Design a protein around this ligand. Structure first.
Ligand SMILES: [Mg+2]
Ligand SMILES: [Zn+2]
Ligand SMILES: [Zn+2]
Ligand SMILES: [Zn+2]
Lengths: 514, 133
């Protein structure tokens, strides 16, 4: 006897306990009033008229089930469901040197975004009348590594300022991608504590004036809001969070990250730490390849990208077969048969690392490496359609995603990789010029072999089904217009088209002449 | 790293943190009671004569043989959770005074403080009760 909590620790340097009233609890009351386990009034020994006692907020340890109230922490599974709800959170801190001692206050709040908010040490302090949120003196933590936090003590900024700054920076980053938040953090504890300041909590509610569920809360006037229609909202109404380290990693976060990702260096700036927590959580779930059981609602613009993907695939590789008349085509990165051009005399060979159980006999099991495999595929042509690899074979038709370009679809990853999401999000390697060294960049063209049938648009680049004339032939002139439109959409979503050096538009004309 | 003074015991950890974070600290607690959660403990308990004024607000503890006596700044939820007070600016009623509760309902004196409000007529608990009405 007896058990005590780090939570609400009284960090004051006051040597006396508290008068039985104005004392928060029987644990607090001073020895002088306590007898037989009871606490007792002594008019003789006076209550403090004026006192300031810092209350530690640490080890908030909140696990509770209320039917109306939603869990703040979410399952590893449920965190996968919502990604880029994902924001890394690690807060550097400071301790109180002077008026009181023993607890920790937020100094620099880091995020998966480059963003870094700093605050003036502020803590909860008890007086006779009320508990009062106020500034405090504080010191940098002791270590030599922590010497860099010294200047940050002075810098800024009021907390009523910061919590609005956080909500806006969170509002604009998350608005299009998700309806909610999840914080990915390494040490569950401290940043839960940092959350006291901006965060509020409660049973789910709907955005005010808006349609969807509410992200934010404004104290100024009782209201609720979402990422979208909400400013001047200083609070976060129902955030979610998950602890990566809670997944059983052996070491410290820096070690675990550094294996998978050599792109994120170390500056002890709080953002770096919170980047690394996403950068590593991504890898853990999403470097495990392309789980198809998950389902991600799309907004948006993606569906059109989806179809335009197939349309540009079909046409390019068709033409590519006409032009250069390859004996065989090696399709790599095809879990299922699915010939992009259904009908060609060409011998079509399938390869992927993981074949589908159905269509397993059609496909050969292979992981492509240029080091091993440049020798073997010499004959015919090779096709990689969103099969992302180290440097590509000389004779090739490939579509690769460029991580560098930005859309609401794709999110950062390890290392330099981006994780692209429409459905079934595939994490992909970083766009690298070195892999396209043998191939050349694929100029736009449009090819149809057809009979022909508001204003005419004539295009030098296309093989018009009929080039005798202008020749704007209302069937092709319209069909070209449509394809170039859905082509310019696929390249806008940042896909790249690469072909063998040998390919030439001209060799297509010879299929026309007859 | 304590190096500090412990004000609280584990059994209350969950509840207080919940009520702390809530936009509605009142409802939050109330619901929690419903959830099969334990009510607040460790609030300050008086050794009394059990004779005195029945009144709920007292400057020095006054208990009926039925009622029991509490420090009460412990039984004020907003004091106990170190969060702002229902009164707009900014002060608390139960800090600097004592509060009595019927012995049966003194299992959860914290809610009892929220649930009921004392009348300005007899300055005593309403319904537990009043000569008025
Ligand atoms: Mg941390
Ligand atoms: Zn990284
Ligand atoms: Zn109070
Ligand atoms: Zn009355």
């Amino acid at each position: 006897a007896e058990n005590v909590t780090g939570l609400f620790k009284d960090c004051s340097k006051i040597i006396t306990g508290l008068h039985p009233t104005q004392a928060p609890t029987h644990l607090s009351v001073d020895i002088k009033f306590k007898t037989e386990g009871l606490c007792v009034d002594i008019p003789g020994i006076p209550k403090d008229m004026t006192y300031r006692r810092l209350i530690s907020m640490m080890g908030f340890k909140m696990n509770y089930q209320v039917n109306g109230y939603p869990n703040m922490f979410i399952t590893r599974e449920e965190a996968i469901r919502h990604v880029r709800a994902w924001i890394g959170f690690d807060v550097e801190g400071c301790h109180a040197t002077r008026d009181a001692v023993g607890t920790n206050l937020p100094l620099q709040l880091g995020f998966s975004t480059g963003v870094n908010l700093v605050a003036v040490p502020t803590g909860y302090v008890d007086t006779e009348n009320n508990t009062e949120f106020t500034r405090v003196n504080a010191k940098p933590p002791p270590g030599d590594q922590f010497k860099h936090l010294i200047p940050l003590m002075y810098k800024g900024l009021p907390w009523n300022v910061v919590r609005i700054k956080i909500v806006q920076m969170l509002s604009d980053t998350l608005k299009g991608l998700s309806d909610r938040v999840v914080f990915v953090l390494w040490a569950h504890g401290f940043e839960l504590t940092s959350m006291k300041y901006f965060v509020k909590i409660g049973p789910e509610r709907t955005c005010c004036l808006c349609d969807k569920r509410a992200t934010c809360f404004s104290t100024s006037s009782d209201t609720y809001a979402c990422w979208n229609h909400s400013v001047g909202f200083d609070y976060v109404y129902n955030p979610f969070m998950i602890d990566v380290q809670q997944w059983g990693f052996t070491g410290n976060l820096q070690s675990n990250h550094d294996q998978h990702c050599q792109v994120h260096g170390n500056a002890h700036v709080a953002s770096c730490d919170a980047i690394m927590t996403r950068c590593l959580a991504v890898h853990e779930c999403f470097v495990k390849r392309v789980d198809w059981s998950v389902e991600y609602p799309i907004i948006g613009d993606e569906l059109r990208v989806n179809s335009a993907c197939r349309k540009v695939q079909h046409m390019v590789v068709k033409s590519a077969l006409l032009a250069d008349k390859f004996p065989v085509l090696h399709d790599i990165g095809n879990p299922k048969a699915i010939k992009c051009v259904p009908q060609a005399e060409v011998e079509w060979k399938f390869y992927d690392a993981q074949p589908c159980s159905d269509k397993a006999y059609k496909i050969e099991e292979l992981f492509y490496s240029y080091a091993t495999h440049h020798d073997k595929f010499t004959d015919g042509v090779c096709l990689f359609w969103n099969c992302n690899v180290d440097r590509y074979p000389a004779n090739a038709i490939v579509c690769r995603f460029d991580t560098r370009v930005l859309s609401n679809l794709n999110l950062p990853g390890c290392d330099g990789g981006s994780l692209y999401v429409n459905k079934h999000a595939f994490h992909t390697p970083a766009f690298d010029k070195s892999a396209f060294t043998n191939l050349k960049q694929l100029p736009f063209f449009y090819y149809s072999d057809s009979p022909c049938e508001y204003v005419p648009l004539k295009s030098a680049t296309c093989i018009t089904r009929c080039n005798l004339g202008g020749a704007v032939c209302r069937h092709h002139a319209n069909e070209y217009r449509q394809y170039l439109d859905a082509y310019n959409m696929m390249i806008s979503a940042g896909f790249s088209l690469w072909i063998y050096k040998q390919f030439d538009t001209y060799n297509l004309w010879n299929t026309f002449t007859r | 790293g304590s190096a500090g003074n412990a004000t609280e015991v584990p059994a209350n950890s969950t509840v207080l943190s919940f009520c702390a974070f809530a936009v509605d600290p009142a409802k939050a607690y109330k619901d929690y009671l419903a959830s099969g959660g334990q009510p607040i403990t460790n609030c300050v308990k008086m050794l009394c004569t059990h004779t005195g004024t029945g009144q709920a607000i007292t400057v020095t503890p006054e208990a009926n043989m039925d009622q029991e006596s509490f420090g009460g700044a412990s039984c004020c939820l907003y004091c106990r959770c170190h969060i702002d007070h229902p009164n707009p600016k900014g002060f608390c009623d139960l800090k600097g005074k004592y509060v009595q509760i019927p012995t049966t309902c003194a299992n959860d004196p914290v809610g009892f403080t929220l649930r009921n409000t004392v009348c300005t007529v007899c300055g005593m608990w309403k319904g537990y009760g009043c000569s008025c009405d």
